[model samples]
Target: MWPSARFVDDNVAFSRMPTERELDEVAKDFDAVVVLVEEYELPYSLEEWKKRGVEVLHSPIPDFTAPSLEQLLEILRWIEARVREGKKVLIHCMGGLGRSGTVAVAWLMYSKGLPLREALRRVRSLRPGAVETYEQMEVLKELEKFLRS
Candidate 1:
């Protein structure tokens, strides 16, 4: 993952470090939670969210392969389902640096009908410090092409 200042905010806002108030706001906004690996787990106390009808899925790893194709596809599937249910989904990763940014770009490509390559480039521009690794770049290409095909 590329290390930079942008790493701070990708989804850290919803991580365990967040204040109670912030977590509450997030819980109010989201209907389901997908947790990727990190120092944090589900934010709200288990009892409250469980009682409030929040669904949580924790997958310690996002993409387990060279291209992250499977993970990207799975994430897209989840998003489509949530949107169909009229839920505004929250997609997050450790620092939103590499993995998070990768999926974020894919989402724009898949949901917003952006050309995959262009979307990745645009995201990079938006976060200048995004030092995406070669593997990460390859994954972006794979996602873009997958959508195009």
Candidate 2:
């Protein structure tokens, strides 16, 4: 199966969870991944992905919600380092819109210094159904002030 993903930037692409079989096909698209939802179990093991030379980072956030400021910052930094390594980064939650979009947009603001609205604009342009909830928007809103304080 092919990945249902879109590269929002040169280094960043976004999608939803991958099944055990889709994992390898999905991995071909990116060098590293941030899986953003907590699940009781995955169809595939984390080790299976790492063995493929892709670093799998599980940064879970509850469904229909957002990451705490601290979590978002950490995710942003990890992505920054990966991109600096010349690695392509992929991010996703279960359904791949809310949590994933929040962090991906956060990366744009954190790294590119775009304001929240502009960052949201950029992400949504490519992935139409992204950044789903208002609470998620609030997280992006406070990210700048949270960093400085």
Candidate 3:
């Protein structure tokens, strides 16, 4: 079975979309869920997640793809603020490998000042099969420039 969620840091974790029951379990652990895929019907509603006291941030991007520069920066800002508040955040995309992995790596780059290779390695060590596509890796490479800007 796939691991429910993989922790990249004490406060930051990444995963695939959680099922209704899984969300219930996650609510106990995570303070927020950052969803990174196009809006679709989920087994649990955003409202339900809110009711469970889990803050939800939905900034949908395409599957198997990288988010635009604007979206990437937005996600970075959100995660950074939440983590600063001592919130345990769960970042997710469909399978938690491509887009989600990209974001996790970018977070390392932006927050930890890690180089791209090390950042990718750190996340892949925690979540196997992360950064699943060359295009995604390319985006991570490009993110280095964005971070420098």
Candidate 4:
């Protein structure tokens, strides 16, 4: 079977963990996986499923709820490694919108210490069709506050 329909980064990940069959399909492919953080449970454990050279990150961003400061920090760490190492990082979320974009934009703000607005401006410049949802924007503001403090 093909991949689940692609959703924006900021939404919930898989409705259920992939079955063995799904993993089997995954093994046939090579791609960086950015699994969404399960508020309740992990969507899948790639421990055995990962193919060679697949860099997987457990970066979870709370999109609908208020973005947690701790999670944002973890995301920043991922960005640091990828940006510094020049590795292909799959920064994923449920939809790749609210949480993914928030975490991504925050990386710019924290790494560059740019104001939230500027960081967001830069993120858009790069991704073009990035999610600047209100919830994500709020998280970005909180991130800025945390950095300033």
State each model's CA lDDT, in order. Answer: 0.55, 0.82, 0.83, 0.55
Candidate 3 Cα RMSD (Å) = 2.1
Among residues 3 or more apart in sequence or in different chains, the pairs in candidate 2 whose N, CA or C atoms overlap within 3 Å are none
Q: List, residue by residue over 1-149, the lDDT tens digit for candidate 2.
A: 24477676788888888788787787787889998867554666778878899987798788888888888888988998999999998888887588888887888888878877798998899777789998888988899676546
- The best candidate by TM-score is 3
Q: Model 1 reaches what TM-score against the true structure?
A: 0.67
Where does model 2 exceed 4 Å of error?
Answer: 1-3, 147-149
Greater lDDT among 1 and 3 belongs to: 3
TM-score result, candidate 3 = 0.91
Arrange candidates, best TM-score first: 3, 2, 1, 4
Superposed on all Cα atoms, the candidates' RMSDs to the truth, in angstroms, are: 6.2, 2.0, 2.1, 6.4
Question: How many clashing pairs per prediction, in order?
Answer: 0, 0, 0, 12
Model 1 sits at a Cα RMSD from the real structure of 6.2
Per-residue C-alpha lDDT of model 4 across residues 1-149, encoded as one tens digit per residue: 33542322222122123454665554344244555556455555566535545667665445454356777787667656655664434445554455555665676676767887876776566555455467667767778888898
Q: Quote each prediction's TM-score.
A: 0.67, 0.90, 0.91, 0.60
At residue 47, what lDDT does model 2 achieve?
A: 83
Question: Tens digit of lDDT per residue, candidate 1, span 12-90?
Answer: 2122223345556656766755555543444545455566576655545534322367876787677667767876555
